[PDB]
């Protein structure tokens, strides 16, 4: 069988330390993991018991994703505007589709999550990474696209894997700079809720010419159950609500009423935010103790974004000697920037603070040994 141009998406770089990571542990290691961008917890406990109930989109679901919008960010928002989704992959692939046309160009920042430029090439688009500068707190300005023909603009705010976030100001920028040259513009809001100083700005507190992605995966908590939710305008909802009927993309119903719950168990997610304020004050003690010294703000989500050209040349096989000889797991940089990740590294603190703490204790010793 013959295999299509856009079949030939790369292979995640960071699946060598993941394999190593579990060939370790069949060893009987055992290795902190600092590599994964989901969170440690699961479901939280009363999104189980509403779906243990029901075993012995969904209207009541959109109208509570609407209510969210109020209060997290005093926006009144149509539940009719809510679109439940398998997750945000099925967010993006709904909006691909939505927005954009064989070889349309479709500009994402570079660091970003490196799921976007595979999903775009993937359906037959054409992404166009942007190198973006610690001085713009690696994330998007208007500068970075104004000489570029593109279809569409996406920035994500808290960043995977930077943290970084953009505030009103640069968020105003960045959408009336998108508009005034044509590009659709996509705000990925996946890991709203994992914020500690700097408030999340939702896109809609700014326009509603805009696609808004997001999930259960992060904030609530449900990676692994394949819902989440976009905001589209109004006139939008009947393109997206056809291409998801006609192309069967929508969310298990069993998620569904889990999500629902989930929605309402404020305390347990916001004691999983505690574990994550946590961890990130021991990073940001410890991490420049250890040789980690230039790092991107991590002003939200779960991640440390490092600088790490003075210690190797090649992140990749630097990862992997940070597994085989601290028994740490992290990610090098080249999924998400391909032209300077080879000088950068991931780490996630989405685990236990115990965990963290053990972490960073192996990597100090790793590092002055080294």
Known sequence: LKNSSRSAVDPFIVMDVMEAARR????????????????????????????????????????RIARLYGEWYGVDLDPGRVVITPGSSGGFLLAFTALFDSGDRVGIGAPGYPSYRQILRALGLV???????PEN?????????????????MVASPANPTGTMLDHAAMGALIEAAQAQGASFISDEIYHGIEYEAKAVTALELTDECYVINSFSKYFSMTGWRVGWMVVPEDQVRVVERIAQNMFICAPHASQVAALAALDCDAELQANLDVYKANRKLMLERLPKAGFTR???????????????????????FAAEILEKAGVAVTPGLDFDPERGAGTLRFSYARATADIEEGLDRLEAFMQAR
């Open 24 to 63: 370790a542990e069949e060893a009987g290691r055992r290795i902190i993991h600092m590599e994964v961008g989901q969170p440690g917890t699961g479901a939280p406990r009363g999104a189980v018991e509403a779906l243990a109930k029901s075993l012995e989109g969904l209207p009541a679901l959109r109208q």
């Open 127 to 133: 992404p166009v990474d942007l190198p973006t500068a």
């Open 137 to 153: 707190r690696l994330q998007p300005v208007p500068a970075d696209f104004a000489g570029l023909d593109l279809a569409g603009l």
């Open 295 to 317: 790092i991107a703000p991590p002003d939200g989500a779960f991640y440390v974004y490092a600088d790490v050209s003075d210690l190797t040349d090649d992140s990749r096989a």
